[PDB]
From a paper:
The γ-tubulin ring complex (γ-TuRC) is an essential multiprotein assembly that provides a template for microtubule nucleation. The complex is an asymmetric cone with 14 “spokes,” each comprising a γ-tubulin molecule supported by a [name]/3/4/5/6 subunit. [name] is a cell cycle–regulated protein that is important for γ-TuRC localization and microtubule anchoring at centrosomes and within mitotic spindles. We found that the C-terminus of [name] forms a tetrameric α-helical assembly that contacts the lumen of the γ-TuRC cone and orients its microtubule-binding domain away from the complex.
To test this hypothesis, we determined the cryo-EM structure of a [name]-containing, reconstituted human γ-TuRC (“rec-γ-TuRC”). In a new processing pipeline, we re-picked particles, cleaned them in RELION, and performed supervised 3D classifications and refinements in CryoSPARC. This improved the rec-γ-TuRC resolution from ∼7 to 4.7 Å and resolved unassigned densities associated with [name]–6 at γ-TuRC positions 9–12, which, at low thresholds, resemble the AlphaFold-predicted [name] pinwheel model. The [name] pinwheel could be rigid body fitted into this density, indicating that [name] binds to the bottom of the γ-TuRC. We next used our density maps and AlphaFold predictions to build a molecular model of the human γ-TuRC bound to the [name] pinwheel. [name] residues F603 and F622 form hydrophobic cores that may be critical for [name] helical assembly, and electrostatic interactions between [name] residues E598, D602, and E605 and [name]-NHD residues K57 and K60 likely stabilize the [name]-[name]-NHD interface. In the first interface, blades A and B of the [name] pinwheel contact the underside of the γ-TuRC. Blade B lies beneath [name]’s GRIP1 domain at position 9, while blade A interfaces with the GRIP1 domains of [name], [name], and GCP6 at positions 10–12. In the second [name] pinwheel–γ-TuRC interface, the C terminus of the [name] tetrameric α-helical bundle density (α-helices H2) splays apart into two helical pairs (α-helices H3), forming a “fishtail”. The fishtail’s upper H3 pair contacts GRIP1 domains of [name] (position 1) and [name] (position 2), while the lower pair is unattached and less well-resolved. Our [name]-bound γ-TuRC structure identifies the latch as [name]:[name]-NHD, allowing [name] to contribute to multiple long-range γ-TuRC interfaces, similar to GCP6’s role in both the lumenal bridge and belt in stabilizing [name]/3 subunits across the ∼30-nm–wide complex.
Residue numbers in the entry:
A (entry chain N): 241 to 253, 277 to 663
B (entry chain M): 533 to 800, 838 to 899
C (entry chain m): 1 to 448
D (entry chain n): 1 to 457
The structure:
Amino acid sequence: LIGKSINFLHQVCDLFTDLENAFQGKIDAAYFETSKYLLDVLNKKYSLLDHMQAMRRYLLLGQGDFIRHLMDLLKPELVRPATTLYQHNLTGILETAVRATNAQFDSPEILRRLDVRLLEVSPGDTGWDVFSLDYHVDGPIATVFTRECMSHYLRVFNFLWRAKRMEYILTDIRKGHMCNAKLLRNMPEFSGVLHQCHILASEMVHFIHQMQYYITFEVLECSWDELWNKVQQAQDLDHIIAAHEVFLDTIISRCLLDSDSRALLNQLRAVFDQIIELQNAQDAIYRAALEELQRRLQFEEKKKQREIEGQWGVTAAEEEEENKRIGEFKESIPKMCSQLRILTHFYQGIVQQFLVLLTTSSDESLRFLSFRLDFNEHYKAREPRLRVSLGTRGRRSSHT
Amino acid sequence: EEKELVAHLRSIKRYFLMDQGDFFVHFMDLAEEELRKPVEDITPPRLEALLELALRMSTANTDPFKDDLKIDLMPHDLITQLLRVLAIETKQEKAMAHADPTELALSGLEAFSFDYIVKWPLSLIINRKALTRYQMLFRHMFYCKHVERQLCSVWISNKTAKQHSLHSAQWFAGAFTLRQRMLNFVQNIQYYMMFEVMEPTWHILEKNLKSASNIDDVLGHHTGFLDTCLKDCMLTNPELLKVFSKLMSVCVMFTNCMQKFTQSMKLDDTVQLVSGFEATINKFDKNFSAHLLDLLARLSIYSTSDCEHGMASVISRLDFNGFYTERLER
Amino acid sequence: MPREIITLQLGQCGNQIGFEFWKQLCAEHGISPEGIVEEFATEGTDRKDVFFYQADDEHYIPRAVLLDLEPRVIHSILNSPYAKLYNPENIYLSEHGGGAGNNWASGFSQGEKIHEDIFDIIDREADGSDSLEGFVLCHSIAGGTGSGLGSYLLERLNDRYPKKLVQTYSVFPNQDEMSDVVVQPYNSLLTLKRLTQNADCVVVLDNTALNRIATDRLHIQNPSFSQINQLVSTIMSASTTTLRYPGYMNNDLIGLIASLIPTPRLHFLMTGYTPLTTDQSVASVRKTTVLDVMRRLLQPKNVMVSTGRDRQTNHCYIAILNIIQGEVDPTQVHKSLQRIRERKLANFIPWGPASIQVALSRKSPYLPSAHRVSGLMMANHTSISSLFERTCRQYDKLRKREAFLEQFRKEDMFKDNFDEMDTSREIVQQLIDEYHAATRPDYISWGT
Amino acid sequence: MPREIITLQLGQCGNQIGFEFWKQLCAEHGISPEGIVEEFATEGTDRKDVFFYQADDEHYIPRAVLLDLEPRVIHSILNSPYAKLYNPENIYLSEHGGGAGNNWASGFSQGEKIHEDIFDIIDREADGSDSLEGFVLCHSIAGGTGSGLGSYLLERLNDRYPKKLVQTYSVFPNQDEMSDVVVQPYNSLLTLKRLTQNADCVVVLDNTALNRIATDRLHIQNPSFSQINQLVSTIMSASTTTLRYPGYMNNDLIGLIASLIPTPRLHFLMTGYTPLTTDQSVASVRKTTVLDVMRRLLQPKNVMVSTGRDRQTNHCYIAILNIIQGEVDPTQVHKSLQRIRERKLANFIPWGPASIQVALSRKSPYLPSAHRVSGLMMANHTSISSLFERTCRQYDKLRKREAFLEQFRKEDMFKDNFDEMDTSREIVQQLIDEYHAATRPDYISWGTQEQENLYFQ
């Protein structure tokens, strides 16, 4: 162990009576001292704790304001086909969100390591499928933040970013619907379409935001804090490496980024995709409702203005066209409401099945995702697994 | 020091030996709602959470090993749990370990017991047999407290009868007396558990742990402590424990009948329903009194054999008005 | 959760007694007069929620309601150290400030006028209580305000929690002394009526008995009204200890009174305490023995109920529970039982199961015990009927004379007649008769 | 980019409440009263950009517009330590200093008179925001100026930012204190109207519950209006903490209100907080148990919202967003919401997935918390309409009696008729119907005139 620690420092940072024991304790003491010195050298030369803090802030979503701002800025961009995304442009958007959020207050050495990575852009891909945070690990810190650990951190970052992007898309849809209700107050027949869009977007936002909360806090943030504490408590470089690897594996498993949670990750991704579909449908419905409301408001304003000018407020041809437009708007509003209800029901079914899988998942973060997705027990009413998991295990351990 | 034997023993006394009587009262008050459910519908984890919350809100929080103390919901009733504990030292231990949980729907209040997590080397002393005996004693005392709580519930329902005219409350009088007899039985069982079982067993455990000379001596002292706690909680005598469990069940049925009769009297055919409920409560009270009288008779025999004035004082505590003395003699 | 007790304070005397009771409960639970838990109260084994409610996440407020028909007492409470103990919404002061004029009926009418405030207080205390058992009303029976308002409070507690047990420590007026309050016998009857109808167990606190205990046991030659109120608070504490100090048994008020109250009508309890000491007499830690405790508790001079020495009637306890704390020798207990039997110092009920429940608890570090070993007895004893029967007879004697009714005729409840006084006297007589029956095997048929 | 929130300060009382809210937000984010980040405020983990905008790389300026018809409060703000936090160009004070005379219509006319300055401030704050979420209107419902000006600000924010979320902190009047403002019900009705029609989320803070808590818990015989208003501001802050304190979820105002506002019309939210403690009661560390906490939370004396007993609507939760402040584990918040569901403290829509969203955020190290554990619930519950419906009915009762209308008749909005009061009552009725619809599967059609006409028959 001593020689291994020395090699890591170099490359990365009674004898007459009982000969067998006379040097054993001395060898062990020298080993301990050498390993501690190697770990201290690795820390001082490779800024292992600073790299771990950068990983926590970016790849573990510890800089929650930064992740929020990135997702909010990406929502109008990430809805576009990824084939139109420029990696330089995505990095610039990330930098702009940093400058617009508390991420600007991070140290330049940390902020320079937090970046936007664009995956290979395919047609039809959204930003949620290709956006990830990354954390570059090198030198002695790369012994703790191994390529596997860095891949797990990037997986958690991308998952949280996609979920937050979908949440913010649905929140923008619902915000548009709610705000336009004030505009559409003069078009009450269209108000219901906006409300349906708001409801569907609210369900999708709730699902995506609960998944993101579980991944970023219960898995990513907690595992990052555990990694940092273990590294600060590490006695040798190998102990730091093992503790960071275990932390990264725990984060991957609870964020569903490990190999064993791959089915859970796929189900969560399908839930996120259905949430994004619901968000997009709600945004389209709300856009149509707001356009109809604006046309009705403009028509009413023109009528009032012509009446004030002493002209016949609307011509019989213009009045018939206005009545036809209002009729078509009212007939589309029940149709928009039905479409939004269908989208909401599909999304809710997918979310319920994802929550059931999460509640049955071995990862605790997935059970917390299920509990958040069913905080009012809507999914728990729909997914039996969320009701059973908390009830079933506590009864068995009380019988011994 | 390393295995915190004294801290574990104090935690076990607070939780498993019911030395922290306020903790057990709080836990049963919290868990009573769950205990009203059928045993199959009772969530053991909810009773465990209520136990841990009573422990943290009571002086059991002062035990440094209290966080190693866990709540265990016994799969069997107090009589069956006691019989299993009595079988532990017998060749029937394997049969009682494999014994199916007692089909009698134990209330969560009556099924509630503590377990204690012992680290090595103290796990040599707090063996599985000692933990099982502590769990049996805990379950027995918890069942007594459940019966007390049921009698108290009947009493609360009967308090409204004081506003009714004597003539209108007459049919409640039998139910009120049955509830009173059930409450007296449950309270005397609790008094036994508290002043003859819990406090003496905790003091014996602490003294034996203080007098241990070696880890095998510590194991012997812990086993003696557990056996004393089981014996004084009536868990070592299967006939006494069976009689106590039957008496508590009859008391609970009497209390429910009395509560129904007092509710009808408060509402007041209602008088006829109240009188029928009172008669049923009186019959349950009779059965409970019979089992209590058999227990008292056995206690009297034991006090008479050894000339132990202490046991006569215990009997005088349990039978201060002599109600159970004549029934035991009968 | 603890079995919370709501304290109803009626009139000047009742409010003083309630304030001293809440002070004593706070001292036993280590609650400051401001509602803050004292640093010395490290024994978290006490049930503070029994006597205090949480007003907010940090402030514990005593469950006390201050009700008066005269503003002087309410202002004195709000000017007392306990001003922050009581919920300000639980303080009802009559705008007219005229009091009840020492008229029970006027006090009752004022209670009716303050009904809303009192029941709001009771509901607020119940909602602040996780497992509210019921209300305990502390009042004096000799005045006008404390009696009528106390009966009103008892009625409203019965109305709001009709399925919950209500135990009361109801101090009945002394019937052998000529009260300067000519309507006191009516007031005493109304208080005994309310204890009979709305309480499940009534501990009778005879101010004559309090004075006797102060003289013979506390060595107080002239017990002050404050000392009488503190004796009444001590009696209430002893009767409520099983509700306020949770243990293995008797953890709820209904559980406590169930063993004591065989029938709903035979709910008149007598109390006894030993050793009884005045606050000034803390100096001498008397080595009180179990025999001395039991004898003084059974002695009418030390009993907080003044029963006459009837030589013809074997007055008896329906049930007694003694919680004894401290060093007790089994041989001393045996000698005590021998001496008690030889002297026949206690008669027990013949008609039902009764026993001494024993819960072992640590003592409060915050409450100084004047005795190395102390014990409280709560008992239902037929000798309390002698107080209630005498109060009823005095009530009938006053009502038949229309004595002091002119002060009551000022209030609407008594403007046309005094029928409420006669009904109160009849209820107190029925309570006395039922309590006396509970000493006899025929208590099963009492009230038939 | 962060979701910026524009603060609209209306009238004397509303502007004072807004100023104190901005002071509290600055303290929680470590912003000095002048808008400069303190040298000690090195923990850049707070989201100042939610409620404040940066004027330069170092100076954070509140996105606040101060509008009053009486100069006293605006001058007191400009004479306060927070004078430099607000843009001086965003402070409109009526030269006459006379206020609105406790007339809602006068307050609305004053808002119309200060329309240009307020909307210029809001537009300037929005343009400095890369992804502005919306405007937050701070006003009082009891006065004259703050209610009308607040309604005007809400209307103009809805008109200008039709795709942006609008959250409101709407202070409901204290019902236990006799208000000297006899026309307060008209102001309250107009404010509830504007929150229902032009806000996307309204956290209702009923001053009556604050007064009840002050009486029972603070031992205050006569709770002043100021203490109730400060409790209401604390409740609004706790409900908005997840927007103002970024975390894993609900880190933006649009994200915060999306989970809280199920339908665009059913945007009337009720709040609950536990444990509630007064700042003064820090002295006694109560060993509160989980059972005691849960029991106190269900007590109306400890709930920071006084919801009326609506007898007509089977109120249910439309949507719930939980803003948790302090050390909060998202899994613990989720378990808490789950436990709330088990107790059925909120009924959710049956036609789609709905839940209490839980965001875990770190607490500010600079703000001492009097409570070891605190939590805010924001919920949209139709029973909150009972406060707004009652305010509307009282407004109609005053207008039909022309009570205190002489102050309103001075303003053009009420010179000829009281149509603004009737429109406020109609908007509150539509809000009630939509909130009732949001309890129903038909919430997809909530706020459509056919449902308002079907719930009013």
